[PDB]
Each structure stands twice: as structure tokens, then as C-alpha cells.
Amino acid sequence: MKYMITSKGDEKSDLLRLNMIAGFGEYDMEYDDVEPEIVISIGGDGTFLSAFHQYEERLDEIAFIGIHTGHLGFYADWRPAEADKLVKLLAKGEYQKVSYPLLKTTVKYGKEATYLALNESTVKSSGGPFVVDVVINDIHFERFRGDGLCMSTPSGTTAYNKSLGGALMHPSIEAMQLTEMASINNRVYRTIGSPLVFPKHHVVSLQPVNDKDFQISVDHLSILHRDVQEIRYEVSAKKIHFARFRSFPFWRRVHDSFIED
Amino acid sequence: MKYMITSKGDEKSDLLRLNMIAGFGEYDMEYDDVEPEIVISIGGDGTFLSAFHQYEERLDEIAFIGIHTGHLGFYADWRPAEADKLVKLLAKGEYQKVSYPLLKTTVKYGKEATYLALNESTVKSSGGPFVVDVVINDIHFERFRGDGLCMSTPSGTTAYNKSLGGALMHPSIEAMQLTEMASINNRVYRTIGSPLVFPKHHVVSLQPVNDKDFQISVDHLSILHRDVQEIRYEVSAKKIHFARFRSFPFWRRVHDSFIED
Amino acid sequence: MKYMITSKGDEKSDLLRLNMIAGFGEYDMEYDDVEPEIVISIGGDGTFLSAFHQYEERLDEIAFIGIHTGHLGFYADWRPAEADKLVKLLAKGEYQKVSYPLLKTTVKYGKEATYLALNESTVKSSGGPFVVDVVINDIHFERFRGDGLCMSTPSGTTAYNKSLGGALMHPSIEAMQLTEMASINNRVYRTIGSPLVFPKHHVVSLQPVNDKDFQISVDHLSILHRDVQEIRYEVSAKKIHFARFRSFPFWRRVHDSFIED
Amino acid sequence: MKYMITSKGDEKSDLLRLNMIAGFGEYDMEYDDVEPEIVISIGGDGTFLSAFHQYEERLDEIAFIGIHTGHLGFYADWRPAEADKLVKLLAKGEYQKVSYPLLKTTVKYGKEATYLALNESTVKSSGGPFVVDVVINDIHFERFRGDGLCMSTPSGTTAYNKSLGGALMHPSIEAMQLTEMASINNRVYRTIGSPLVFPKHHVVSLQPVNDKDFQISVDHLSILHRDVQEIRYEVSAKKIHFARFRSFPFWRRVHDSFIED
Ligand SMILES: Nc1ncnc2c1ncn2[C@@H]1O[C@H](CN2CC#Cc3nc4c(N)ncnc4n3[C@@H]3O[C@H](CNC(=O)NCCCNC(=O)C2)[C@@H](O)[C@H]3O)[C@@H](O)[C@H]1O
Ligand SMILES: Nc1ncnc2c1ncn2[C@@H]1O[C@H](CN2CC#Cc3nc4c(N)ncnc4n3[C@@H]3O[C@H](CNC(=O)NCCCNC(=O)C2)[C@@H](O)[C@H]3O)[C@@H](O)[C@H]1O
Ligand SMILES: Nc1ncnc2c1ncn2[C@@H]1O[C@H](CN2CC#Cc3nc4c(N)ncnc4n3[C@@H]3O[C@H](CNC(=O)NCCCNC(=O)C2)[C@@H](O)[C@H]3O)[C@@H](O)[C@H]1O
Ligand SMILES: Nc1ncnc2c1ncn2[C@@H]1O[C@H](CN2CC#Cc3nc4c(N)ncnc4n3[C@@H]3O[C@H](CNC(=O)NCCCNC(=O)C2)[C@@H](O)[C@H]3O)[C@@H](O)[C@H]1O
């Protein structure tokens, strides 16, 4: 297999990467960071998100693996001490692939840009008040006034979405979840309050009310967009694929990350 | 079609029912409350939940319709003024069927009882402290200490689940959602806090820790169970079917019920 | 000083109590559980709440001290290993007194009963729906529909109130805090949602709307009241007094109980 | 009395102001915007906050009055139709003064700046991750990681603080309330979660952990501070004073603004 390895870049991660490369040299494994079939991320979830975005144009051809060199990362399945066992198992093709859903964000102006999110896409104002109309499948649902909005994938539900009161969703559910950031609610201004969970093929559109400039973040890459006509969220047709070598169920992963491990 | 009509029993609902019966008499419609194919509920969501439980043994043979005689009911699609138009459309078979998921609860003792919920199943203590171990697909996930737990269907997400901070979920998603009621969280006792959303085929089991008596409510029918070994939640294979005569999208229904109408 | 010692009653607490009694015998200390001036509670916060209610008729004549024999108790200032140092310091009168506010609950029928709470007073229905009008200083404020209501003292804010989303309040603030349990909020039914913090001399009255039977709990002593006309909450004029031998600030106590220790 | 009138500046507010000025001309009232004793704000709460900050250096010499020309403003006690009755009552000195507490924020660098807030002071990062140590009366209480923090006065509790889950506090309570914005909570990172309510003379200090640049907002005036050593919050010794001409209790004001009016 062609493979590549990204590192967080501290001394620990860089040496783990060099040692795994040396270990891969003893098998029919070619290091190739243009067209890898296996992408190994060594670091944390931030490192793993950067790896996903480096290869977002070849998701259907890649299985990802995460090694956490600090504390547990949610997209990590290996500790550094297990890296040799990983090399051997990867080499012998001894794995099954697991797929998580992805979120597509489309930004239109006055022209379009699309982004793929593994965790979430959020939107805030570029300074002034944040006010958008929320339109669900072309039905006007609410006018949102507040700090911003967060649209999460299932595997993203344990990240920013969790901090905003959202529900944790198992990743086999093909859905996206919208959570509010500090909405205004009084007798004049009203939002639903609750997180909202949307299935595949529903489209959630945000439409400016006054200011048209927004800070849009996709997995914490945050970009100012000007003259925005619409921001459209839907579950992507594209999926990220994971190499899985043993059972590490999602709910155990949640348990280990939030309850005790 | 065989049909029947349940009424909340106030003067308004009883007369609407008699007038609809008279209207049905002018078509090939037989009143039959043993084996109806159409069940019409006139009242509110409580009335509609009672209708569902009166016929839970023939869900695959029945389409339900709700008329709200007070303010909007979530399971209601008609106002009383539209009852004549309903009679005519029902008679001419001018409808499509829509299915919502259901929740199955199994209670084992030391012997089993199962219940079907359209909104939710909740569990509390019979007086003493409520303490259960939460086991997800045979994996011990947390020990819950607090007031109780609520497992909601998708259409139930807008009911008790909403009041407990849960996410609102579109009913095409085959899932159930677990929410906490006032858990204890300190350095000794820890729960996940967040609502949890489970797909079809996941089993959530509650296991007593000390007290074995629980008050279990299914759609607000609340029953004391003694000597409980286990309470198991899963998405039912059974579905409730609705007669639909026009588009009334779920998110518009949410909008009309919580934002403005 | 006259003193007494209550024990949780496990082997550990009973022996600690006997050893402290023996230690007190070596000083001008008389064991007296009718008119103690010092009440020592050995156990947990439940034990300490029982001690407070055993002596609620002599609060102005008593300083309380808590020993936690299990993990940290919020009303506890001593570990069991420090009991000897406690005996010596108590005996030599080497302490300052600290006062926390208390909550008064009055229940009227059709006749009155009053209770004093150190943590909180809550109200629920005796089975049926819970619906009360909330009246603040004779001003109708909201009609509450839901599971119940919790009125907390400042030192109670870290207990049930915390689990219900309430704010943690420093105990020098003479106030009470009202929190909701799972209110219904839709276009027909509306509550404030937020916790409410009331100063001394404000009166919060709950008035039945339909059912007149309520389960009222004061520090987890829960009693059915029938034919209730009114439930009135106000900050008590009475205060619980603590013996303090060293600085153990409230916010450090919070830190140690919820963050790390 | 010397008085001045600020207007939101729309046609409606400017004409109300001119008509009130004309009405004041018929009494012993001098228009003076350098040293007014009465400051009348015509507009909304934003207008009223701007009036407060225009005169923050003479709070002990000023009574404020608010007129809301749009929907109810929380700092507003008059509708535009009552402006004549206001002029007459103000002129004849027919009023009592009411005082609300204020929040003092001190920012130190490496040099100090202080600000007075009527609603709240918030702190966020200037872009990068927000990470501060929270120190309460020189006791390290938690390391906060998340979007930011909000410190609210009592009258501010119904504003941003409310949107962040904070408790609503009656303004006679001399306190400040700290609320979190989307904190990270997992097995590695822990915050208290709950709002915290501090009495007079407690000092809450925020200390940078890595990045030293912060966006600090005081009543929605938002300013970048660089090279920050510390941000200190305490209840101000200074108070804003209101002219009151009739009873309009705080809890009725809350009721009218959030429940119905
Ligand atoms: N106010 C907020 N509250 C909560 N989360 C927030 C907030 N703002 C942004 N984010 C999330 O940061 C992601 C991106 N950063 C790497 C990551 C992750 C991750 N992904 C998952 C997952 N799928 N499941 C469970 N845990 C996960 N984690 C865990 O978050 C912790 C690290 N993140 C933070 O410090 N963020 C705060 C600002 C700084 N960020 C970064 O520079 C990049 C590590 O523990 C990591 O393991 C974004 O995508 C949001 O989601
Ligand atoms: N603390 C609580 N907070 C919030 N809900 C609670 C709480 N406790 C129990 N329940 C729910 O009551 C259901 C059952 N009652 C009929 C119904 C409904 C319904 N179903 C849906 C739906 N699927 N989507 C959107 N709205 C829905 N509604 C709307 O609730 C309002 C009526 N219910 C209440 O007064 N309950 C409080 C106790 C009294 N109950 C009853 O005697 C029977 C009407 O407005 C009705 O339209 C149970 O199943 C829970 O879910
Ligand atoms: N759903 C709920 N969620 C959260 N609390 C609830 C709930 N229902 C009731 N209560 C509280 O129980 C008190 C009374 N019980 C002894 C105590 C305490 C206490 N007082 C304080 C304080 N002032 N500050 C910080 N921690 C405190 N604790 C800590 O609570 C833990 C123990 N309590 C519970 O298991 N209760 C659940 C039901 C069983 N209870 C009891 O048999 C008696 C121990 O850790 C103890 O240290 C009542 O008064 C409420 O407040
Ligand atoms: N995410 C957020 N969620 C909730 N509040 C937020 C958020 N961010 C900032 N703020 C608050 O805005 C204040 C400042 N703006 C004028 C005011 C007020 C006020 N003060 C009180 C009070 N003491 N009690 C009850 N209601 C009050 N209101 C009511 O807020 C509504 C208007 N405010 C907003 O649109 N803000 C969002 C951004 C735009 N802002 C402004 O350009 C200036 C009107 O209804 C007004 O009446 C700041 O100081 C925060 O507190």
C-alpha cells in the first residue's frame, strides 16, 4: 500500500513517525504523500483534522488511522506504544473499513464555495450583531439573533456541539445537528432553543437579515466571507473511511473520553 | 373502510365525532372499533396517545388521524372546521401513509413485560434514591444517580425530551434519545450529562444498583414495577402509520408549535 | 461546653464518635444531647442535615461541626484523622462562628405548617399533573407546568439546585434561589426558564390551579400535604452557625468538591 | 434642575426629545449636557447604555430615566405617550431615587485601565484559543478553556447572562455573576459549568495561560487589549441611580419582558 504519516511536529510525534516509516520499510509499503491509500495521523484530534483536510479530495480512496501521543483523541484508536503492532497489522491488510458521515457547507455570494467538515461548521458575525433567517427545506423556520450557530456531524457531536448542549449521536446515523450559541429570547425575539437533528437530504439555509459579512469556521479553519447571500448545510454524500483493527465501539470511546479511562 | 373515532369527551369533541359519523354514513364507511383500518382521534395529544394505545396490537393495519379541538396538538393535522373536508377525503381514499418510529421497553423481573411508546418511556425510583447502571450494547457506560431517565422516540423529542434539554429529531430518523433528569455530578459521581441518540439495533439496559422498585411511565401511563432485574430500551420494529392528506412538514409543525402560528 | 455527637452509624463513624467522647472526657466538656451548645456530625452531608433538623429549635444556641468519614461532604470541615486536633481546639474554645442563611417554607391549608431548610425545599405533585401559579410579592409572575420547583438556600446551591442548572451562590448573600424541574414551554405554556434569585423579605407564593395535593420535601424529608391553599417561601430570619477553626473558604470548598482535590 | 435628553436618533425619538424640551421650557428646567442632574434616554436599552457611559464620571450626581420608543426596554419605565406626564412629574420633583449595583473591571498590562459596566463585561480571545486561569480571592479555582466568560451585574442578569444560562437576580442584591460561554469539559479539561454569584468585596481575577491578547467588551463596547497580565472583576462601589415615579417592580418588569405584556 501507498501510505503517508503526518505528525503534530513535537519531538515525540516526529520520532514515532520516523520509527513507523522504518518499520514500514520492512514490508510492501511505499511512502507516498501525493496518492496515499492509508493516511496515519500522529498527534491529537487537531492533527487528525488537518490530515483529513490535506486529503479531502481523495476521501473515497483513503483509510485514515489516528495515533494520540498526548491524552486520548477522539479520532485516535492507538497509543504510541502500539505503533509496531499497527505497522504489522496494516501491512498484512488485516483490517475492516468503517465510514462516518460528513457535513457539506455551501456559501453563495454575488458565486459559490463548498467545504467539507469532519467535526462542524459554525457561523458568526464579522463584528456587528449576528442575525440570520433559518430556512429548512425552503420553509422559514426562525429568525436567529445571538452569537452564532454550529452545525455538527455525528462524530463532531462530542466536540463543540457537546459544549453547546447538543446531543451525542452515534456515527452510523446519517444526520447533522444544529446548535445555538447564546440566542436572545424575550417577548420580541424567539428561537427554538433546542438542538435540531436533520436527516440526509434536508437542507438548512441561513439567510442574512442586515449585515452580509460572516466568519465561517469549518473544523476550526475560520474564514471571513463578504457579501454572503446564503449559507447552505446538508449531509455530504462523501464519507471519511477509517481503518479498524479491533472493536473500539463509539460508546466506549465516549465513555473513555468523558466518564473515566 | 372500517373506521372508529375516539373523543376527548367534552361537549365539543363528542359533537364533532357525532357529526363526522353522520358524514361517514353517506359513504362506504363502516363504524367498527374492534378492527378499524382508520382511527380518528378528536381531542388533544393525550387523546391521540390513548387512541394509539387502544390499538397498539394492530398498528400495521391502522392509519391514525388527529383532530385538535383545543390549541394545536403535535399529533394533530386538522382543526375542527376542516372535519367535513377530512370525511370526504378519507372516504375517497385520497391519502398517503407516513410512518414514525416507536420505542420498545422491556422490563424483566425474577419474567418479562414489553411496552410500546409513541412519545417516551421514563424511569424513576419508587421513593428512595434512583441509582442505575447504564449498559449500552453490553458495555457498562455510566452509573446514573439523579431523579430519573427519559427515552424518547423521534416524534416524542418535542415533548418531555424537549423539556429535559434533548435535541429535536426529524421522525424519518430511526432512533431513540436518552435524556437525564437532574443527575448528581461531583468528584465522586459522574454522568455524561448530554442527551444520547441511539440508532436502530442498539440496546440500552438499565440495571439496579440497590433498590429494585421503579416507577416506569410509557406515554404517561405510570406503573410501579417491583423486583426489577433490567429495563431494556430499543427502537421497535413496529411503526405507527399516519393518514396524510396534504403536506404539513415536521419542521413546520415544530415552527407552528414553538415559534409562532 | 455541653456538646453532642451524631453518627451515620456505620462501624467507622460509631468508633470515631466513641473515641472523641473519650477525648472530650479529658476536658471541661459535658455530653448533653438535650441542650448542647456544640453539635458534631460524623458521617456525610445527609448525617449533617439530620443533625441540623434534630436541633432546629435551638439554632441560635448551637454551633455545628461536620466530620466526613467518606469522601468530602460539603458541610464537613474535618477528615477523621483530624478528630483529635478538633477535640483539643473545641475544648480550648479556639474558634470563630460563621453563619449561613436558611429558607423558611410555610404551607397553608383550610391552618399552617412551617419548615426550615438548610439545603432546599421542593414541591411536586402527588401523582397528577403539577400546575401552580407563581406569585412574587403578591404579583402574579407565571403559571408553572412541569415536574416541580426547587427553592434553595445559598449553601444549598451546590446540591439539588446545581443539578437543575442553578447558579452557585456564596453563603454570605442573604437570598434564596428558585429553579425549575422540566417545565413545559410551547406557544400555549410559558415559564421564565432561568433560575431566579430573591433577596431577604421577598415572598414567593405557589398557588394551586387544579389539584391541591403536593409532595413537599425539605432537605429530602418528603411529606404529602393535602388541601393546600398556598406554599410560601422566604429567607428565614434564623441562621445556622458553624464552628470554624481555620480558613476553608466557600470557593475552595466548591473547587475541592467539583473540580479536583 | 439641569437635565439633558439623548435620543436614539430616528425621527420618532428626535421629535419626542424636541417636544419634551419644549415642555421643560415651561418650568424651572435648564437644558445642560455638561453637568445634568437628570439624564433622559429616549430609545432602547442600547440608547440607555450609551447615556450611562456618556455620564459615567458623574453617576453620584445624576438620576437616569428611560423612555422606550420601540418595544419594552428593560431600563425603560415610560412609553412615549406618557412623556408629558413625565415632564410634569420630573419638574415638580415628584420622585424617589432607586440604585442598582455596577461592575468594575480592571485590566492590567506591563499599567491599568478600569471600566464600569451596567450590564456586563465579557472576555474572549483575540482569535486564537481562549484559556485563562480563574482566581477567586487569590485562590486558583479553575482553568477555563472555551469561547469566553461573562461577568454580569444584577440588572444585567436579564441580558447576555440570561442567554448563557445564568440566574436572574434582583437588583437590591449587591453581587456579580460569572457565566461560561461553551467551555470544554472532558477527562482532561474541567470547569465548574454552573454560573457563579459573588458578593461585594470578592475579587475574581483572570490570568492568561498562553495568549495574552483579549477582546474585552463592557456593555457591548468591545476593545482589543494586548499584553494583558490580569483582568479583575469586583462589584463597584459606584451605583447608578434611577428616578422612579411609580412602582414598577423588578419582577413585574421581568414578567412583562419575558412572559407576557
Ligand atoms: N468552545 C469550544 N468547546 C468545545 N470544543 C470546541 C470549542 N471551540 C472549538 N472546538 C472544537 O475544536 C476543534 C479543533 N481543534 C482540535 C480538536 C478537536 C476535537 N474533536 C473531537 C470530537 N469529534 N469528539 C470529542 N472530542 C473532540 N476534540 C477535543 O477537543 C480538544 C481540543 N479543542 C479545542 O481546544 N477547541 C477550542 C479552540 C481551539 N481549537 C483548535 O485549535 C483546533 C481536545 O481534547 C480534542 O481531543 C473544533 O473542530 C471544535 O469542535
Ligand atoms: N415535565 C414535562 N415537560 C414536558 N412534557 C411532559 C412532562 N411530563 C410529561 N410530559 C409529556 O406529556 C405527555 C402525556 N400527556 C398528553 C400529551 C402530550 C404531547 N406530546 C407531544 C409531542 N410528541 N410533541 C410536542 N408536544 C407534545 N405534547 C404536548 O404536551 C402538552 C401536554 N402534556 C403535559 O402537560 N405533561 C405533564 C404531565 C401531564 N400529562 C398528561 O396527563 C398526558 C400539550 O401541549 C401537548 O400538546 C407525555 O408523554 C410526556 O411527553
Ligand atoms: N436529583 C438530585 N441531584 C442532586 N442533588 C439532589 C438530588 N435529589 C436530592 N438531592 C440532594 O440530596 C440532599 C439529601 N441527601 C444527603 C445530601 C446532600 C448534599 N448537600 C450538599 C451541598 N449543600 N453542597 C454540595 N453537595 C451537597 N450534597 C451531596 O449530595 C450527595 C448526596 N445526595 C443525593 O444522593 N441525592 C439524591 C437522592 C438521595 N438523597 C438523600 O437520601 C439525602 C453527596 O455527595 C452529598 O455530599 C437533598 O437536600 C438535595 O439537595
Ligand atoms: N448573544 C447575546 N444574547 C443576549 N444578549 C446579548 C448577547 N450579546 C450581547 N447582548 C446584550 O446586548 C447589550 C448591548 N446592546 C443593547 C442592549 C440591551 C439589553 N439590556 C437588557 C437588560 N439589562 N435586561 C433585559 N434585556 C436587556 N436588553 C435587550 O437586548 C436586546 C438588544 N441586544 C442585542 O441584540 N445583543 C446582541 C448583539 C447586539 N447588541 C448591541 O448592539 C448593543 C433588546 O431587546 C434589549 O432590550 C449587551 O450589554 C449584552 O447584554
Side-chain angles (χ1 to χ4, degrees), chain A residues 1-84 86-93 95-228 230-261, chain B residues 1-84 86-93 95-228 230-261, chain C residues 1-84 86-93 95-228 230-261, chain D residues 1-84 86-93 95-228 230-261:
Chain A
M1 289 238 178
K2 295 182 184 292
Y3 75 97
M4 65 87 62
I5 302 177
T6 73
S7 159
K8 141 165 228 54
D10 60 327
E11 172 187 12
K12 184 176 179 63
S13 301
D14 285 342
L15 292 169
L16 190 47
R17 172 176 182 284
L18 291 190
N19 267 342
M20 285 185 92
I21 290 180
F24 282 127
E26 312 290 350
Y27 299 98
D28 195 12
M29 299 294 286
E30 177 197 345
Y31 191 99
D32 176 342
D33 67 10
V34 186
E35 278 177 2
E37 311 179 298
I38 300 296
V39 162
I40 309 170
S41 182
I42 300 178
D45 286 327
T47 308
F48 186 93
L49 263 347
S50 286
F52 165 83
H53 286 286
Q54 184 172 347
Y55 293 99
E56 47 186 28
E57 261 108 283
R58 269 180 69 267
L59 295 175
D60 227 57
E61 312 162 50
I62 294 181
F64 286 90
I65 310 176
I67 304 186
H68 58 82
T69 48
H71 298 305
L72 218 212
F74 220 75
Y75 295 108
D77 303 332
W78 304 83
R79 290 186 306 116
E82 306 179 299
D84 294 325
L86 190 48
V87 160
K88 179 169 179 167
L89 287 188
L90 250 192
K92 317 210 117 175
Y95 62 97
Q96 321 201 267
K97 289 175 215 166
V98 160
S99 292
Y100 286 177
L102 300 171
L103 175 72
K104 181 217 248 279
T105 311
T106 304
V107 189
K108 330 219 295 178
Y109 315 90
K111 200 32 230 276
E112 294 185 358
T114 62
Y115 311 82
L116 228 45
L118 174 57
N119 265 353
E120 80 280 311
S121 187
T122 72
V123 51
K124 300 171 190 179
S125 180
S126 78
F130 179 69
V131 187
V132 292
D133 287 316
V134 183
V135 177
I136 304 169
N137 301 318
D138 300 333
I139 299 208
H140 176 283
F141 177 81
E142 67 185 359
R143 178 165 287 183
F144 182 87
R145 281 183 196 72
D147 284 351
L149 287 169
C150 172
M151 187 71 88
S152 176
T153 66
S155 67
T157 54
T158 34
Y160 207 169
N161 166 95
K162 183 172 187 285
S163 290
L164 296 161
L168 315 182
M169 302 176 59
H170 187 271
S172 56
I173 305 174
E174 294 187 325
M176 59 183 179
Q177 185 172 176
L178 181 76
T179 46
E180 311 186 336
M181 305 172 186
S183 56
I184 308 193
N185 273 278
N186 57 36
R187 158 179 54 99
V188 176
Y189 307 128
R190 220 152 142 185
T191 65
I192 188 69
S194 309
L196 309 190
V197 173
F198 296 95
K200 257 232 167 186
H201 307 289
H202 284 202
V203 177
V204 176
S205 175
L206 303 182
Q207 280 163 42
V209 170
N210 192 31
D211 189 19
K212 279 174 135 174
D213 301 359
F214 303 85
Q215 191 79 26
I216 292 153
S217 82
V218 176
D219 296 335
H220 204 252
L221 157 113
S222 193
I223 290 175
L224 181 49
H225 297 260
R226 296 197 201 285
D227 186 41
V228 155
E230 196 184 12
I231 303 164
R232 299 170 70 83
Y233 298 115
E234 59 208 290
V235 178
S236 173
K238 290 152 169 186
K239 287 178 143 238
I240 182 186
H241 306 286
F242 293 89
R244 292 261 122 108
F245 291 80
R246 37 187 198 188
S247 179
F248 187 13
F250 177 80
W251 297 116
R252 175 151 271 150
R253 200 190 295 275
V254 171
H255 168 269
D256 292 348
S257 285
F258 296 105
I259 305 295
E260 157 234 1
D261 177 11
Chain B
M1 289 238 178
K2 295 182 184 292
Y3 75 97
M4 65 87 62
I5 302 177
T6 73
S7 159
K8 141 165 228 54
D10 60 327
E11 172 187 12
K12 184 176 179 63
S13 301
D14 285 342
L15 292 169
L16 190 47
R17 172 176 182 284
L18 291 190
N19 267 342
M20 285 185 92
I21 290 180
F24 282 127
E26 312 290 350
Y27 299 98
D28 195 12
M29 299 294 286
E30 177 197 345
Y31 191 99
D32 176 342
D33 67 10
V34 186
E35 278 177 2
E37 311 179 298
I38 300 296
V39 162
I40 309 170
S41 182
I42 300 178
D45 286 327
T47 308
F48 186 93
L49 263 347
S50 286
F52 165 83
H53 286 286
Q54 184 172 347
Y55 293 99
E56 47 186 28
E57 261 108 283
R58 269 180 69 267
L59 295 175
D60 227 57
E61 312 162 50
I62 294 181
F64 286 90
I65 310 176
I67 304 186
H68 58 82
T69 48
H71 298 305
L72 218 212
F74 220 75
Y75 295 108
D77 303 332
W78 304 83
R79 290 186 306 116
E82 306 179 299
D84 294 325
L86 190 48
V87 160
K88 179 169 179 167
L89 287 188
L90 250 192
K92 317 210 117 175
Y95 62 97
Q96 321 201 267
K97 289 175 215 166
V98 160
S99 292
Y100 286 177
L102 300 171
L103 175 72
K104 181 217 248 279
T105 311
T106 304
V107 189
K108 330 219 295 178
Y109 315 90
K111 200 32 230 276
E112 294 185 358
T114 62
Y115 311 82
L116 228 45
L118 174 57
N119 265 353
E120 80 280 311
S121 187
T122 72
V123 51
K124 300 171 190 179
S125 180
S126 78
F130 179 69
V131 187
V132 292
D133 287 316
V134 183
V135 177
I136 304 169
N137 301 318
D138 300 333
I139 299 208
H140 176 283
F141 177 81
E142 67 185 359
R143 178 165 287 183
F144 182 87
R145 281 183 196 72
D147 284 351
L149 287 169
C150 172
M151 187 71 88
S152 176
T153 66
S155 67
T157 54
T158 34
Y160 207 169
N161 166 95
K162 183 172 187 285
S163 290
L164 296 161
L168 315 182
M169 302 176 59
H170 187 271
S172 56
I173 305 174
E174 294 187 325
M176 59 183 179
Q177 185 172 176
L178 181 76
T179 46
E180 311 186 336
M181 305 172 186
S183 56
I184 308 193
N185 273 278
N186 57 36
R187 158 179 54 99
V188 176
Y189 307 128
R190 220 152 142 185
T191 65
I192 188 69
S194 309
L196 309 190
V197 173
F198 296 95
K200 257 232 167 186
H201 307 289
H202 284 202
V203 177
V204 176
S205 175
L206 303 182
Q207 280 163 42
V209 170
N210 192 31
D211 189 19
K212 279 174 135 174
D213 301 359
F214 303 85
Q215 191 79 26
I216 292 153
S217 82
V218 176
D219 296 335
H220 204 252
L221 157 113
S222 193
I223 290 175
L224 181 49
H225 297 260
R226 296 197 201 285
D227 186 41
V228 155
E230 196 184 12
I231 303 164
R232 299 170 70 83
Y233 298 115
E234 59 208 290
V235 178
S236 173
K238 290 152 169 186
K239 287 178 143 238
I240 182 186
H241 306 286
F242 293 89
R244 292 261 122 108
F245 291 80
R246 37 187 198 188
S247 179
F248 187 13
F250 177 80
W251 297 116
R252 175 151 271 150
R253 200 190 295 275
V254 171
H255 168 269
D256 292 348
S257 285
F258 296 105
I259 305 295
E260 157 234 1
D261 177 11
Chain C
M1 289 238 178
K2 295 182 184 292
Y3 75 97
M4 65 87 62
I5 302 177
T6 73
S7 159
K8 141 165 228 54
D10 60 327
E11 172 187 12
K12 184 176 179 63
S13 301
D14 285 342
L15 292 169
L16 190 47
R17 172 176 182 284
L18 291 190
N19 267 342
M20 285 185 92
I21 290 180
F24 282 127
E26 312 290 350
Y27 299 98
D28 195 12
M29 299 294 286
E30 177 197 345
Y31 191 99
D32 176 342
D33 67 10
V34 186
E35 278 177 2
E37 311 179 298
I38 300 296
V39 162
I40 309 170
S41 182
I42 300 178
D45 286 327
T47 308
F48 186 93
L49 263 347
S50 286
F52 165 83
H53 286 286
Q54 184 172 347
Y55 293 99
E56 47 186 28
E57 261 108 283
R58 269 180 69 267
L59 295 175
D60 227 57
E61 312 162 50
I62 294 181
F64 286 90
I65 310 176
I67 304 186
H68 58 82
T69 48
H71 298 305
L72 218 212
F74 220 75
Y75 295 108
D77 303 332
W78 304 83
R79 290 186 306 116
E82 306 179 299
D84 294 325
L86 190 48
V87 160
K88 179 169 179 167
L89 287 188
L90 250 192
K92 317 210 117 175
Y95 62 97
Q96 321 201 267
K97 289 175 215 166
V98 160
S99 292
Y100 286 177
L102 300 171
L103 175 72
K104 181 217 248 279
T105 311
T106 304
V107 189
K108 330 219 295 178
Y109 315 90
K111 200 32 230 276
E112 294 185 358
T114 62
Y115 311 82
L116 228 45
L118 174 57
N119 265 353
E120 80 280 311
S121 187
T122 72
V123 51
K124 300 171 190 179
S125 180
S126 78
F130 179 69
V131 187
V132 292
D133 287 316
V134 183
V135 177
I136 304 169
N137 301 318
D138 300 333
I139 299 208
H140 176 283
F141 177 81
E142 67 185 359
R143 178 165 287 183
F144 182 87
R145 281 183 196 72
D147 284 351
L149 287 169
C150 172
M151 187 71 88
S152 176
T153 66
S155 67
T157 54
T158 34
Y160 207 169
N161 166 95
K162 183 172 187 285
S163 290
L164 296 161
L168 315 182
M169 302 176 59
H170 187 271
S172 56
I173 305 174
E174 294 187 325
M176 59 183 179
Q177 185 172 176
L178 181 76
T179 46
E180 311 186 336
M181 305 172 186
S183 56
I184 308 193
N185 273 278
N186 57 36
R187 158 179 54 99
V188 176
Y189 307 128
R190 220 152 142 185
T191 65
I192 188 69
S194 309
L196 309 190
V197 173
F198 296 95
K200 257 232 167 186
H201 307 289
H202 284 202
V203 177
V204 176
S205 175
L206 303 182
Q207 280 163 42
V209 170
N210 192 31
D211 189 19
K212 279 174 135 174
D213 301 359
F214 303 85
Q215 191 79 26
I216 292 153
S217 82
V218 176
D219 296 335
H220 204 252
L221 157 113
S222 193
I223 290 175
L224 181 49
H225 297 260
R226 296 197 201 285
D227 186 41
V228 155
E230 196 184 12
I231 303 164
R232 299 170 70 83
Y233 298 115
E234 59 208 290
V235 178
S236 173
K238 290 152 169 186
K239 287 178 143 238
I240 182 186
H241 306 286
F242 293 89
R244 292 261 122 108
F245 291 80
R246 37 187 198 188
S247 179
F248 187 13
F250 177 80
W251 297 116
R252 175 151 271 150
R253 200 190 295 275
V254 171
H255 168 269
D256 292 348
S257 285
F258 296 105
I259 305 295
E260 157 234 1
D261 177 11
Chain D
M1 289 238 178
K2 295 182 184 292
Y3 75 97
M4 65 87 62
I5 302 177
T6 73
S7 159
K8 141 165 228 54
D10 60 327
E11 172 187 12
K12 184 176 179 63
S13 301
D14 285 342
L15 292 169
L16 190 47
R17 172 176 182 284
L18 291 190
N19 267 342
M20 285 185 92
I21 290 180
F24 282 127
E26 312 290 350
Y27 299 98
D28 195 12
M29 299 294 286
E30 177 197 345
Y31 191 99
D32 176 342
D33 67 10
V34 186
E35 278 177 2
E37 311 179 298
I38 300 296
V39 162
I40 309 170
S41 182
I42 300 178
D45 286 327
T47 308
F48 186 93
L49 263 347
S50 286
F52 165 83
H53 286 286
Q54 184 172 347
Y55 293 99
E56 47 186 28
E57 261 108 283
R58 269 180 69 267
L59 295 175
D60 227 57
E61 312 162 50
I62 294 181
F64 286 90
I65 310 176
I67 304 186
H68 58 82
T69 48
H71 298 305
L72 218 212
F74 220 75
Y75 295 108
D77 303 332
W78 304 83
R79 290 186 306 116
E82 306 179 299
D84 294 325
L86 190 48
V87 160
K88 179 169 179 167
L89 287 188
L90 250 192
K92 317 210 117 175
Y95 62 97
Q96 321 201 267
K97 289 175 215 166
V98 160
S99 292
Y100 286 177
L102 300 171
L103 175 72
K104 181 217 248 279
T105 311
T106 304
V107 189
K108 330 219 295 178
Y109 315 90
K111 200 32 230 276
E112 294 185 358
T114 62
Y115 311 82
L116 228 45
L118 174 57
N119 265 353
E120 80 280 311
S121 187
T122 72
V123 51
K124 300 171 190 179
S125 180
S126 78
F130 179 69
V131 187
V132 292
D133 287 316
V134 183
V135 177
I136 304 169
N137 301 318
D138 300 333
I139 299 208
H140 176 283
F141 177 81
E142 67 185 359
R143 178 165 287 183
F144 182 87
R145 281 183 196 72
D147 284 351
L149 287 169
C150 172
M151 187 71 88
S152 176
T153 66
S155 67
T157 54
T158 34
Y160 207 169
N161 166 95
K162 183 172 187 285
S163 290
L164 296 161
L168 315 182
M169 302 176 59
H170 187 271
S172 56
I173 305 174
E174 294 187 325
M176 59 183 179
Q177 185 172 176
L178 181 76
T179 46
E180 311 186 336
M181 305 172 186
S183 56
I184 308 193
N185 273 278
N186 57 36
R187 158 179 54 99
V188 176
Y189 307 128
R190 220 152 142 185
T191 65
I192 188 69
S194 309
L196 309 190
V197 173
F198 296 95
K200 257 232 167 186
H201 307 289
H202 284 202
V203 177
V204 176
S205 175
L206 303 182
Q207 280 163 42
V209 170
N210 192 31
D211 189 19
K212 279 174 135 174
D213 301 359
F214 303 85
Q215 191 79 26
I216 292 153
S217 82
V218 176
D219 296 335
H220 204 252
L221 157 113
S222 193
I223 290 175
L224 181 49
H225 297 260
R226 296 197 201 285
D227 186 41
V228 155
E230 196 184 12
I231 303 164
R232 299 170 70 83
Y233 298 115
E234 59 208 290
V235 178
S236 173
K238 290 152 169 186
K239 287 178 143 238
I240 182 186
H241 306 286
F242 293 89
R244 292 261 122 108
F245 291 80
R246 37 187 198 188
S247 179
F248 187 13
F250 177 80
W251 297 116
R252 175 151 271 150
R253 200 190 295 275
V254 171
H255 168 269
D256 292 348
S257 285
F258 296 105
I259 305 295
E260 157 234 1
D261 177 11

